[PDB]
């Protein structure tokens, strides 16, 4: 199993950050590893928000979504991929789903690929909807 | 059960249909109406309005076990005090809640589960944006 | 808005029903009728088992289905349209979702019009299948 | 964490790789072994089984604050079972549960709602269906 690994940190202080990317890589790496996978990639956002999508490496995991070259994004921590639940629901329903791409995020221990992973997906984009509707 | 009915518009449904419909959903499942507690002109944004206030201060004197409203956003606009209302004000004195719009009902098995989700999932939510 | 009503007991000793035929009908004609609704015929098995589908007045409602004469079917409680979660997921979800006619049990207060209603059967039928798959 | 490791085959994988997987797995966290409880030619319909017993009793102990098998059938093959252990054993007494193959840990925010739909639906379930 070829898996795609992503981390971010907002800062370039790696000494300061809670978790440095080297930190992350390093779980990420090890547990895909413990897990039998080979990380085919490293996508690292060092200097970026999590707030909107729009960071280099994350726009070329997306891009190179379409390659078939892994079939699974790895994160440590939700966060890193995304600090918005609507960027969220669209990265992991639209676009890794949608392409067949599993993802998981360790440290929630959420996985797509499994029955409860998914579900919680689908009760995630139910319940922000439904909250959405009952705010506006 | 005896059921508390609160309605609400701001500054959806007049106040008046919204006492139509839930007064005529009470009695056509057999439910007797303890008092209407209607707040004509007030925002759902937050939770200091005359009536609600009427109905949280009237829990002390046990003259309903339920309450009942139209459409949850009548209750309140914030996930934050509706799961506040709900859990931590009407469940935590053994009052049911009941939506007619969202067929929530806390004394039903679903509705419990969905409140305990909406919930869970809210606190999920705030921590990853936050 | 037109609505079936099904309404089913075991045997056909009324006085000795917990909730007889006519209290069935009674009551989601009631209901109904506070909704603003209109009954558009009465489905009743009158001493059948819940237990498989095999049924006159089921079969019937099943037929009937693709006649769009009604968009809800009511049931005073889950029980009495099925004592099988997998008759009833099927119902639901393979016959009157499939057809885009919503379904409402009252005692429960199910309504697979309604967000938390549908999101009800997406878990039930998710939860199911995972019990099953450890079960077997 | 200090984690139990469960295995089972009764008379899918090898006790061998059952093992091998999840020491990996732990090493890999960071997490320590504390003893490994191994049923090798037991039933997972019913609980009554060695080395699961010899697991339930060291709970009392504290050598361990989380229990770890490969699959949620090699705990047992009965949700009732499962969901006593899980809910009444373990979580009673400040025990996390993960079972790698179904990537749920109950010390997780999904992983403890999943417990908590798979409780409700069950007993939704059997209320149907007795």
């Given amino acids: 199993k070829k898996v795609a690994i992503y981390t971010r940190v907002s800062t370039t202080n790696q000494a300061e950050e809670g978790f440095s990317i080297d930190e ?7 547990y895909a590893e413990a897990m039998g996978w080979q990380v085919s990639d490293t996508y690292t956002d060092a200097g970026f928000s999590g707030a909107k999508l729009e960071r280099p490496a994350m726009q ?6 379409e390659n078939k070259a892994f079939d699974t994004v790895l994160v440590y921590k939700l966060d890193r991929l995304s600090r918005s639940v609507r960027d ?3 990265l992991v ?3 890794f789903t949608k392409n067949k791409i599993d993802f998981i995020s360790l440290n929630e221990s959420i996985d797509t ?11 995630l984009s139910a319940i922000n909807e439904f909250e959405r509707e009952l705010e506006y």
Same sequence: chains 1, 3.
């Fill in 24 to 30: 992350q890589i390093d779980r990420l790496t090890k």
């Fill in 60 to 65: 070329r995991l997306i891009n190179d979504i």
């Fill in 88 to 90: 969220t629901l669209y």
């Fill in 93 to 95: 329903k639209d676009v």
């Fill in 113 to 123: 690929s499994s029955a409860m992973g998914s579900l919680f997906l689908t009760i």
